[PDB]
């Protein structure tokens, strides 16, 4: 039972930078069931425009892959733990604008407590609570 816990809601200003954490725990230790195998996507939900995909971070080597609209202004880092059954995922959006106000979700792709879903990265079951970032003056 992988659970993802995010940080609190933040109120920023245009031109600022927000760093949302994402604590993940319960992955497991065995290879294929560890945090160093399951990517942590970052999905933005703007009210009215539906969900939007921002990028995913693979926690083994930190290999990130950002969406085209956000290249140059988004950075993802990891804090994978010792046992590799947990960790923390960060995302920094350094060029916040008025249109970036939304609820940001960190998600993984582990549906079941006993299945190796390492190579199926788009079954986004473990959604985070959601960090409501408000960017306004």
């Amino acid at each position: 039972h992988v659970q993802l816990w995010q940080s609190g809601a933040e109120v920023k200003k245009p031109g600022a930078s927000v760093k949302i954490s994402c604590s993940a725990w319960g992955f497991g230790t065995t290879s294929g069931y560890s945090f160093r195998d399951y990517r942590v996507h970052w999905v933005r939900h703007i009210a009215g425009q539906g969900f939007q995909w921002m990028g995913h971070m693979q926690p083994r080597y930190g290999a990130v892959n950002y969406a085209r609209q956000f290249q140059g202004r988004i950075t993802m880092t990891r804090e994978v733990s010792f046992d590799a059954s947990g960790g923390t995922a960060y995302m920094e959006l350094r060029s916040l604008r008025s249109d970036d106000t939304a609820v940001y979700y960190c998600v993984t792709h582990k549906l079941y407590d006993g299945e190796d879903a390492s190579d199926l990265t788009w079954r986004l079951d473990p959604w985070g609570q959601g960090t409501r970032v408000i960017v306004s003056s």
């Binding site: 497991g28 230790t29 065995t30 069931y33 407590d113 006993g114």
Partner: protein, 54 residues
């Protein structure tokens, strides 16, 4: 007259010792967390045990 007839596969056993390997249910262990008594290395046991009455 009588002549020797060898039979293969007679139901005959003798008391002896041997190396007894391990088998365990797949569902018994979580398959995610290790055990001090290694269960993953045990061969997967048959879902239906084959017990024969004599």
């Amino acid at each position: 007259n009588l002549w020797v007839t060898v039979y293969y596969g007679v139901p005959v056993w003798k008391d002896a010792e041997t190396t007894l390997f391990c088998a365990s249910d797949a569902k018994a262990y979580e398959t995610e967390k290790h055990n001090v008594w290694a269960t993953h290395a045990c061969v997967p046991t048959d879902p239906n045990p084959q017990e024969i009455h004599l």
